[PDB]
mmCIF file of C-alpha atoms and ligand atoms in Angstrom:
data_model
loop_
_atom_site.group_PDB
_atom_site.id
_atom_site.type_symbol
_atom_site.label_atom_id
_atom_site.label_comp_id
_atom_site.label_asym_id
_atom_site.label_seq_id
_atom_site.Cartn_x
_atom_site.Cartn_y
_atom_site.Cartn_z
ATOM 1 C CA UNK G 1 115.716 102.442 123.770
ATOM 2 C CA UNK G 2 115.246 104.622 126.728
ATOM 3 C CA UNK G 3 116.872 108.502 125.989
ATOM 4 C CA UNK G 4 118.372 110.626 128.683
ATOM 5 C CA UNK G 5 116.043 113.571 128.740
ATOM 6 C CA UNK G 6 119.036 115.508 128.682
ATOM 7 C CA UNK G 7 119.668 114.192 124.787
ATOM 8 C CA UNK G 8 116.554 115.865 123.766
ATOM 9 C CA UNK G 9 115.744 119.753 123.113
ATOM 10 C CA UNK G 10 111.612 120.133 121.978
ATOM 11 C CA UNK G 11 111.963 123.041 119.450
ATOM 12 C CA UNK G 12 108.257 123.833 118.428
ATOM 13 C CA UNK G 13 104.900 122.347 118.373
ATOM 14 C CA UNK G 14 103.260 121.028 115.016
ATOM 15 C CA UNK G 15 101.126 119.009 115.449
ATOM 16 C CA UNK G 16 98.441 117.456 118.213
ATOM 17 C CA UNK G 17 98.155 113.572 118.358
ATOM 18 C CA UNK G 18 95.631 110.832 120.033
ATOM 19 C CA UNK G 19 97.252 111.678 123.529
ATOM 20 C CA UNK G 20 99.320 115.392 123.498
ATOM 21 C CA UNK G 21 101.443 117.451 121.140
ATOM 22 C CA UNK G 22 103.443 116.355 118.384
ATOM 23 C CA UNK G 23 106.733 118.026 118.211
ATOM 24 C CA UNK G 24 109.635 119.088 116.652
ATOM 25 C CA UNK G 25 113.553 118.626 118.232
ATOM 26 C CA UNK G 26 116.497 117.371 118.490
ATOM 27 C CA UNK G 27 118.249 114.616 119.601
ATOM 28 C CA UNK G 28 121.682 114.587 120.424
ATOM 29 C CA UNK G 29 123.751 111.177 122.479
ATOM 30 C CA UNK G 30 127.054 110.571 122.987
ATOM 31 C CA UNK G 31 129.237 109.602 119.825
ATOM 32 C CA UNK G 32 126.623 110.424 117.338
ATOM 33 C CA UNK G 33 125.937 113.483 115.275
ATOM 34 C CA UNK G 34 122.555 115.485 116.543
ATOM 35 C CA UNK G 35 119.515 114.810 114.432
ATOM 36 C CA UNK G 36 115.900 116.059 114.235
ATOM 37 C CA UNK G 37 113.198 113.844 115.700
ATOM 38 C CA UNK G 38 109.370 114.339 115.935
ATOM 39 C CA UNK G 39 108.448 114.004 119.470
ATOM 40 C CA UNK G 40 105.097 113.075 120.920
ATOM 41 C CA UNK G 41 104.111 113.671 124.401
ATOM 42 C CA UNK G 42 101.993 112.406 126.885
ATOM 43 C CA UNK G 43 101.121 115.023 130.043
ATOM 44 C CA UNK G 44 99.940 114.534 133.430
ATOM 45 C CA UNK G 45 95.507 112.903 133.583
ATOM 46 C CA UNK G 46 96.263 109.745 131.522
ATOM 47 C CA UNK G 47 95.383 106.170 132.995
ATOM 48 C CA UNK G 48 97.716 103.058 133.030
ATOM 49 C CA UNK G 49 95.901 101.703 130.248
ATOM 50 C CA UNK G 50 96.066 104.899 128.737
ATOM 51 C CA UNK G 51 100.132 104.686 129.059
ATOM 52 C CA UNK G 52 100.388 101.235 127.801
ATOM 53 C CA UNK G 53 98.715 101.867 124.583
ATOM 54 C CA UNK G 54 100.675 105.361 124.186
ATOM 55 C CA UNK G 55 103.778 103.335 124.231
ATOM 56 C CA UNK G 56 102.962 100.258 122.611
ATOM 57 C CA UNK G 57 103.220 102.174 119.095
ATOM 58 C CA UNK G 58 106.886 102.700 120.462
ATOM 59 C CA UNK G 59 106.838 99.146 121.124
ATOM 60 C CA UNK G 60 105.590 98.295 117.749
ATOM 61 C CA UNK G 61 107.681 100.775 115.437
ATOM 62 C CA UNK G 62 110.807 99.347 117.140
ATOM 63 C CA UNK G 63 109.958 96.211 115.753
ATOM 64 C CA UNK G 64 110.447 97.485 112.163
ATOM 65 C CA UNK G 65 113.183 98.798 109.942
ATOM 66 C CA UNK G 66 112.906 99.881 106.479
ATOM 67 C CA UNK G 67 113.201 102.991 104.858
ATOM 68 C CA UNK G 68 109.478 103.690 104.072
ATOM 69 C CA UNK G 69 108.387 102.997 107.592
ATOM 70 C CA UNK G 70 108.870 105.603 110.066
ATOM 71 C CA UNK G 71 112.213 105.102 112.533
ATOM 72 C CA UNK G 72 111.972 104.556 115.989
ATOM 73 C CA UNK G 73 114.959 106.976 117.648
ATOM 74 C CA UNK G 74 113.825 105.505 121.515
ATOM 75 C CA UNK G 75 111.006 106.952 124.466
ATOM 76 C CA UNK G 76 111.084 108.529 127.412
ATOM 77 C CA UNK G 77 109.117 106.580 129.934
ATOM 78 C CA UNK G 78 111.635 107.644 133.568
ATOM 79 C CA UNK G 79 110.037 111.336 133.552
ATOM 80 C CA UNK G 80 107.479 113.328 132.678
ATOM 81 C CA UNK G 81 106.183 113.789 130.307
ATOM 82 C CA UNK G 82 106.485 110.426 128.291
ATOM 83 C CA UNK G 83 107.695 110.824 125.122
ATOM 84 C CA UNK G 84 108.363 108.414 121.767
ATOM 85 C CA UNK G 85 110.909 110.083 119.308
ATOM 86 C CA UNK G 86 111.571 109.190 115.832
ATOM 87 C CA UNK G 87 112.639 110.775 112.514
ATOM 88 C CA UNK G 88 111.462 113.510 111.283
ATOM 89 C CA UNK G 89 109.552 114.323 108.332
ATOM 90 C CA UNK G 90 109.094 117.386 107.444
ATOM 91 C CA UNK G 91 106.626 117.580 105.175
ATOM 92 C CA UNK G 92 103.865 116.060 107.440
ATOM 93 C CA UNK G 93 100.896 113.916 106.457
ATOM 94 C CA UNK G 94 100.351 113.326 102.729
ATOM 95 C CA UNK G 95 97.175 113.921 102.312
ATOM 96 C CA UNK G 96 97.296 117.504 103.929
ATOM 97 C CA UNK G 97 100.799 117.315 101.663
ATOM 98 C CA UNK G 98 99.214 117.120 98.461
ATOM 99 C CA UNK G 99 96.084 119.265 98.966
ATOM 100 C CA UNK G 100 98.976 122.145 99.638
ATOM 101 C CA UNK G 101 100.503 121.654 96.925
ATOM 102 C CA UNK G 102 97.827 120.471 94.406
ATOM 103 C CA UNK G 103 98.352 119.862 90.674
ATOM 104 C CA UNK G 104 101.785 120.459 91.400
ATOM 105 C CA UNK G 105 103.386 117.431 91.375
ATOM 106 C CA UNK G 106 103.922 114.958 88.532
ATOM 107 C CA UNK G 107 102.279 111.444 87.903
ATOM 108 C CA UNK G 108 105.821 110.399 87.857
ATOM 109 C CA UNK G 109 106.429 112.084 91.077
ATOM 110 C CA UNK G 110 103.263 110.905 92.595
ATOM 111 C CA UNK G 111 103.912 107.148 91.284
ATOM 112 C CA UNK G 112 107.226 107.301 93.089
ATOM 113 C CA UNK G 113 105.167 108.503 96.093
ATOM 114 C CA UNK G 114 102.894 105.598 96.270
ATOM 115 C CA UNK G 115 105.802 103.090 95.332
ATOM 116 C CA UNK G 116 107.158 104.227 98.366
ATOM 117 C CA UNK G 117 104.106 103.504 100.437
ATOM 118 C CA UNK G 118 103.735 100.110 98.995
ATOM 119 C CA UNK G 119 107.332 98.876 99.888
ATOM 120 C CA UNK G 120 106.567 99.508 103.555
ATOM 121 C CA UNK G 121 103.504 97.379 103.264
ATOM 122 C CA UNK G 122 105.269 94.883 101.415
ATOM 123 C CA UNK G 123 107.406 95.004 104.431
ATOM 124 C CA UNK G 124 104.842 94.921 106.940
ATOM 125 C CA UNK G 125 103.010 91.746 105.013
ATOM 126 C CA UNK G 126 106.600 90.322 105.072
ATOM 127 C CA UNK G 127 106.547 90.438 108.683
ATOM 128 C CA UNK G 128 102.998 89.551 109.188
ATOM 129 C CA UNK G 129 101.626 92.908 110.569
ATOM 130 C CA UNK G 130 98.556 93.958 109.092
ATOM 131 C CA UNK G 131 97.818 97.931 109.602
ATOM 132 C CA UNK G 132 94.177 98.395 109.637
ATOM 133 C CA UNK G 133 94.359 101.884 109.289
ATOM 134 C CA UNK G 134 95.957 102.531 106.193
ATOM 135 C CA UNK G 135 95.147 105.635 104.836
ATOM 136 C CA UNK G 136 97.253 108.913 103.186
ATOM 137 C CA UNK G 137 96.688 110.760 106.252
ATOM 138 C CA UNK G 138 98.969 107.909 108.377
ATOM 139 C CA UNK G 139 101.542 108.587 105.245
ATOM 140 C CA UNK G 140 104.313 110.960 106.334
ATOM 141 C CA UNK G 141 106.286 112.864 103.569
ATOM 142 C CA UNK G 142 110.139 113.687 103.913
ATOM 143 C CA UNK G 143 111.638 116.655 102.414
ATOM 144 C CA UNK G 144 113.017 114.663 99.414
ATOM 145 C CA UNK G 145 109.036 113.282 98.988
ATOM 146 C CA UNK G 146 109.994 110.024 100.639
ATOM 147 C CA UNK G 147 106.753 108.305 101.936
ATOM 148 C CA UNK G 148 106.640 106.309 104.969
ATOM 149 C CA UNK G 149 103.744 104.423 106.959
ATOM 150 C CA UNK G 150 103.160 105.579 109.910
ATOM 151 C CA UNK G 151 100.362 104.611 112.814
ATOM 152 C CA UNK G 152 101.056 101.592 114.407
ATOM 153 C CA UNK G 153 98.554 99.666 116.947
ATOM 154 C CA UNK G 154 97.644 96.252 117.862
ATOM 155 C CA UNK G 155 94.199 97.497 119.842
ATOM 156 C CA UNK G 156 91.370 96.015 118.662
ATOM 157 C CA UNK G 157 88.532 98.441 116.841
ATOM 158 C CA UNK G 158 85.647 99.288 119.210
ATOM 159 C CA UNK G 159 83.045 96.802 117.011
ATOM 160 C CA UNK G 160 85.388 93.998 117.478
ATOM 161 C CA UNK G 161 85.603 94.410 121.869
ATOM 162 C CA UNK G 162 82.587 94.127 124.804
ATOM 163 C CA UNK G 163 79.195 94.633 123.406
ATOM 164 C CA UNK G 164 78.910 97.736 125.607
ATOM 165 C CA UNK G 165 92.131 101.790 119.232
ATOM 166 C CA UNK G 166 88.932 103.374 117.817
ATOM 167 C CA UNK G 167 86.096 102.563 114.972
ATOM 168 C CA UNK G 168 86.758 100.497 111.829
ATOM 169 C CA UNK G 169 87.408 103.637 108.847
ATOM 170 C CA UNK G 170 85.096 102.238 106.791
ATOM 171 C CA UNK G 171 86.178 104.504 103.629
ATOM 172 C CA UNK G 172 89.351 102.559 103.931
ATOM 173 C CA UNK G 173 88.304 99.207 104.865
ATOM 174 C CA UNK G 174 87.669 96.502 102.864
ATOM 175 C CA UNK G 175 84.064 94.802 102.356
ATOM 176 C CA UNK G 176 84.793 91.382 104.505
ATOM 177 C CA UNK G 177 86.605 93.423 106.951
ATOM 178 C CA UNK G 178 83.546 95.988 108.051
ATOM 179 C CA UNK G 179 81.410 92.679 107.763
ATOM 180 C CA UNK G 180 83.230 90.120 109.677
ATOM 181 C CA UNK G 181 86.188 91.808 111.036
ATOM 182 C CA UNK G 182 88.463 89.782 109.130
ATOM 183 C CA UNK G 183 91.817 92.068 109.055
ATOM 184 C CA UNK G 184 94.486 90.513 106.782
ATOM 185 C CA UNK G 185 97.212 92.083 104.015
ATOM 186 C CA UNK G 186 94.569 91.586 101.809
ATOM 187 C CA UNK G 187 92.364 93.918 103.051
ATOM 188 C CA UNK G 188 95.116 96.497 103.531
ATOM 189 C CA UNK G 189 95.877 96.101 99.173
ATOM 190 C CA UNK G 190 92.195 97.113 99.315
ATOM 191 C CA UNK G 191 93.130 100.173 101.911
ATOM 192 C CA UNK G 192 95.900 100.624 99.607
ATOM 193 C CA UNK G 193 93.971 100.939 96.287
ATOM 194 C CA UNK G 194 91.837 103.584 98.284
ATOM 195 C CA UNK G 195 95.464 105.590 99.054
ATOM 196 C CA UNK G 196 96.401 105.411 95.365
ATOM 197 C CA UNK G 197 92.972 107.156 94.668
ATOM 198 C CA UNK G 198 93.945 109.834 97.600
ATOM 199 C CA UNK G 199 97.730 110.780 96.409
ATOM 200 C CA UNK G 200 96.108 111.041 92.268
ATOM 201 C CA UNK G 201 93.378 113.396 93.454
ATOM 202 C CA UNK G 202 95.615 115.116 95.700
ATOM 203 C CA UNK G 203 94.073 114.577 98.734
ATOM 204 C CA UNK G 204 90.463 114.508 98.314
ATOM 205 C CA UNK G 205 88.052 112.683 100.605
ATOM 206 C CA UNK G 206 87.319 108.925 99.190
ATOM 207 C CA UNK G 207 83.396 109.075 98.707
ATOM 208 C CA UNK G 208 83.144 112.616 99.049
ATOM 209 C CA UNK G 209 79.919 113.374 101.192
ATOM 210 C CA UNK G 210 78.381 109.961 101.378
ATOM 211 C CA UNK G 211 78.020 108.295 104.655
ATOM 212 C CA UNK G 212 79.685 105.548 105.883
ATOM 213 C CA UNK G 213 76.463 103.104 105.561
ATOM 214 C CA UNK G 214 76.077 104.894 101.843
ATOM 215 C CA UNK G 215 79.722 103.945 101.114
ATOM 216 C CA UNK G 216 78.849 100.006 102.624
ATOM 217 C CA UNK G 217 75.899 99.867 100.569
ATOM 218 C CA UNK G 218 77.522 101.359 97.377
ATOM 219 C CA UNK G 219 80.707 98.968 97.528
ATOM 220 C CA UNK G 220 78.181 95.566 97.914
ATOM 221 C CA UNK G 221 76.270 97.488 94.814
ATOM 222 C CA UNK G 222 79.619 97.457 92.659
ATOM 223 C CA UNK G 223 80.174 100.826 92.557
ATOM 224 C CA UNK G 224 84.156 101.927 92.764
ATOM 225 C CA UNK G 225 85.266 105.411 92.650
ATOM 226 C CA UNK G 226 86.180 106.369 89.160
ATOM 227 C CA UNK G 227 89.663 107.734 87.521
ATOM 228 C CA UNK G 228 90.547 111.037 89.391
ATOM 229 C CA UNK G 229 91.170 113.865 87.408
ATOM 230 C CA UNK G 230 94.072 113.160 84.716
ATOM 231 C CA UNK G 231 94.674 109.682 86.273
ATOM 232 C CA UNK G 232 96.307 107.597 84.393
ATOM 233 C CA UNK G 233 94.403 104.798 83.276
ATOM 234 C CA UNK G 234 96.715 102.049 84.233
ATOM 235 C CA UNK G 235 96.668 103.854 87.497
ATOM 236 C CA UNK G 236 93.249 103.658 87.980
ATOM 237 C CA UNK G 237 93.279 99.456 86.991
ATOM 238 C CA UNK G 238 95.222 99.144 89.498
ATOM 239 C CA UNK G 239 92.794 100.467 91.881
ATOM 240 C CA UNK G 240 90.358 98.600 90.313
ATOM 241 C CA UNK G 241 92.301 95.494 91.113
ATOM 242 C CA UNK G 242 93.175 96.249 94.867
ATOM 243 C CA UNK G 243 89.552 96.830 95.044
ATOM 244 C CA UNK G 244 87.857 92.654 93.965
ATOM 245 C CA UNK G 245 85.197 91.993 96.202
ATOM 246 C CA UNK G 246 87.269 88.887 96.420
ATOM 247 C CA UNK G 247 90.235 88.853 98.781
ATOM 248 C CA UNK G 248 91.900 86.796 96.900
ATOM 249 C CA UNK G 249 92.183 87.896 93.869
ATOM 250 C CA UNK G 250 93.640 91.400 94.821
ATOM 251 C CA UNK G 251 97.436 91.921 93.931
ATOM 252 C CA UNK G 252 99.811 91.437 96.553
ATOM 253 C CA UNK G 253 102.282 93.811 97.637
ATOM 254 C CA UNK G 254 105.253 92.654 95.703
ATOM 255 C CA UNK G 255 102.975 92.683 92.979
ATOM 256 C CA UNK G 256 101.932 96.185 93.674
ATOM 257 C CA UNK G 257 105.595 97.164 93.573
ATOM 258 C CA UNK G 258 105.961 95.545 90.600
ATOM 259 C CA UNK G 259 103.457 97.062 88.643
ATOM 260 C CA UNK G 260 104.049 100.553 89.822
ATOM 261 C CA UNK G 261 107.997 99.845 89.365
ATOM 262 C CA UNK G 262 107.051 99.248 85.391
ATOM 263 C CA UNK G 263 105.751 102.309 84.919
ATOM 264 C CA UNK G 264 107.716 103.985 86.492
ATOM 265 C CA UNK G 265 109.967 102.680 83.579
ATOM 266 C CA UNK G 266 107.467 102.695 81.059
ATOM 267 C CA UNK G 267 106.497 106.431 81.492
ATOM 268 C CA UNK G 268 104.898 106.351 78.053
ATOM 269 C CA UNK G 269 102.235 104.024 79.642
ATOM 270 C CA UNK G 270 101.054 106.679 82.008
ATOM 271 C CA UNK G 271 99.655 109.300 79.032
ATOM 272 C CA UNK G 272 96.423 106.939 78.531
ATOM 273 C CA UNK G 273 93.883 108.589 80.851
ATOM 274 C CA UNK G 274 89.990 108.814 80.212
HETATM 275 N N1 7X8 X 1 100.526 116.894 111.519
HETATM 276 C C1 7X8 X 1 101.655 116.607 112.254
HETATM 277 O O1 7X8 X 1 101.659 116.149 113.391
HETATM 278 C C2 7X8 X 1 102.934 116.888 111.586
HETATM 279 C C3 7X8 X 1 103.113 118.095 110.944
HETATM 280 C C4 7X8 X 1 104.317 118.364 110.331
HETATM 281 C C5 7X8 X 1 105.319 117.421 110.374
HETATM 282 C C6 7X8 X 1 105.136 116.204 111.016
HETATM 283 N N2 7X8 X 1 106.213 115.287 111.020
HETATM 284 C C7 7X8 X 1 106.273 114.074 111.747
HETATM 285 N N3 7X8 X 1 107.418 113.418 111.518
HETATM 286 C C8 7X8 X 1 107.577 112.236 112.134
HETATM 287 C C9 7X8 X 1 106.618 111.706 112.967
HETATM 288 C C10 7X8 X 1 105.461 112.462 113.137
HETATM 289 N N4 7X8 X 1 104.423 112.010 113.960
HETATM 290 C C11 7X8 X 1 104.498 110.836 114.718
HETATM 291 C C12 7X8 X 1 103.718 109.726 114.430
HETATM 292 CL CL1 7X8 X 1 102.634 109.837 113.069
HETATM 293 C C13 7X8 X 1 103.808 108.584 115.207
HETATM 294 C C14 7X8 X 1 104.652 108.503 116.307
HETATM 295 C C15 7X8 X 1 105.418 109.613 116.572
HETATM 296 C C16 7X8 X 1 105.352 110.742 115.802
HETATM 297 O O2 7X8 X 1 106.222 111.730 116.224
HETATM 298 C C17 7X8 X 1 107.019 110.949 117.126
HETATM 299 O O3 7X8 X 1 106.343 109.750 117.577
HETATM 300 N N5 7X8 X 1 105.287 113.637 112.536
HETATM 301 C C18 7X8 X 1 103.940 115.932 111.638
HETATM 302 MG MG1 MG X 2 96.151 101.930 113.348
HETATM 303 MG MG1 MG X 3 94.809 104.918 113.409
HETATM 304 MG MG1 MG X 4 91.424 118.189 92.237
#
């Protein structure tokens, strides 16, 4: 949906993105009620290509609509500078979120969180897109703690184009996709097993300071990153599950919902942690 630059006011700068700023405003059209939107711009210096792939997450997002994956208001593309609007959240990235505000939120709380992220993605499997780049920091937070996936891109990563949309995050990325670039839902469950670990430690960095090839090495070796702090253990099976070297065997994502959905009504279940 194109928007008459006149239907948008930019009201502060909060962020910086791939391309420009990220924004906050409003949007106001005929016949509807003003709302907030985040705003991302592109200036002035940017290629054609460049353009293209600004806009195709515009593109993409438009394609969706669910309430855990972030709404597409419309773009900008007749002036300058280009813009893509959608909602607002205004709590930011979740990651950033929850290292704020650490120890501060519940396990129910956070299990509500992540059930959150893992509707989207059983919406995105639904409609056979596969993110790639799932990860708490492309979770944005609502001021009611809504979660919603965010980041959307159908570039290829840098290892999978010419010998000579950026490199694979290997933290996040599951063993047969760094290997043979295989990118399917079932290697997002694994990028989602690695978010569950993110939003229970509030926010720290999966594999702390190992490298990426010690991280590669490690996850061939068996190792998987233990219970965070006061993790529930049925939390932490979970993880363990998203995380079988074996595609196959990893829940799906109405599983995932599932399981989180039980205990969420089986609070009880949560107080067994190691
Ligand atoms: N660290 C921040 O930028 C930030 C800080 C505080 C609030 C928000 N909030 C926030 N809310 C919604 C979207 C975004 N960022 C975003 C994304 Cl992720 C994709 C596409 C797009 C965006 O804005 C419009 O077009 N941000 C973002
Ligand atoms: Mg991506
Ligand atoms: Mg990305
Ligand atoms: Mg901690």
């Amino acid at each position: 949906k194109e928007i008459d630059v006149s239907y948008v006011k930019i009201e502060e700068v909060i962020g910086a993105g791939e391309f420009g700023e990220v924004c906050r405003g409003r949007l106001k059209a005929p016949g509807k009620k003003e709302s907030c939107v985040a705003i991302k711009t592109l200036k002035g210096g940017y290629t054609e290509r460049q353009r293209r792939e600004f806009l195709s997450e515009a593109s993409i997002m438009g394609q969706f609509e669910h309430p855990n994956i972030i709404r597409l208001e419309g773009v900008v593309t007749n002036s300058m500078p280009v813009m893509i609007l959608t909602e607002f959240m205004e709590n930011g990235a979740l990651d950033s979120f929850l290292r704020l505000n650490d120890g501060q939120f519940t396990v129910i709380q956070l299990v509500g969180m992540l059930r959150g992220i893992a509707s989207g993605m059983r919406y995105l499997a639904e409609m056979s897109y596969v993110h790639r780049d799932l990860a708490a920091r492309n979770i944005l937070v609502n001021s009611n703690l809504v979660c919603k996936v965010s980041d959307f891109g159908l570039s290829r990563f840098l290892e999978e184009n010419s010998s000579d949309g950026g490199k694979i995050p290997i933290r996040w990325t599951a063993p047969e996709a760094i290997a043979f670039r295989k990118f399917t839902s079932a290697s997002d469950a694994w990028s989602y097993g690695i978010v569950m670990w993110e939003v229970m430690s509030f926010g720290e960095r999966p594999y702390w300071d190992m490298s990426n090839q010690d991280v590669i090495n490690a996850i061939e070796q068996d190792y998987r990153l233990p219970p965070p702090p006061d993790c529930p253990t049925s939390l932490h099976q979970l993880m363990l599950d998203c995380w079988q070297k074996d595609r196959n065997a990893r829940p799906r994502f109405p599983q995932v919902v599932s399981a989180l959905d039980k205990m969420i009504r089986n609070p009880a279940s949560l107080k067994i942690v190691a």
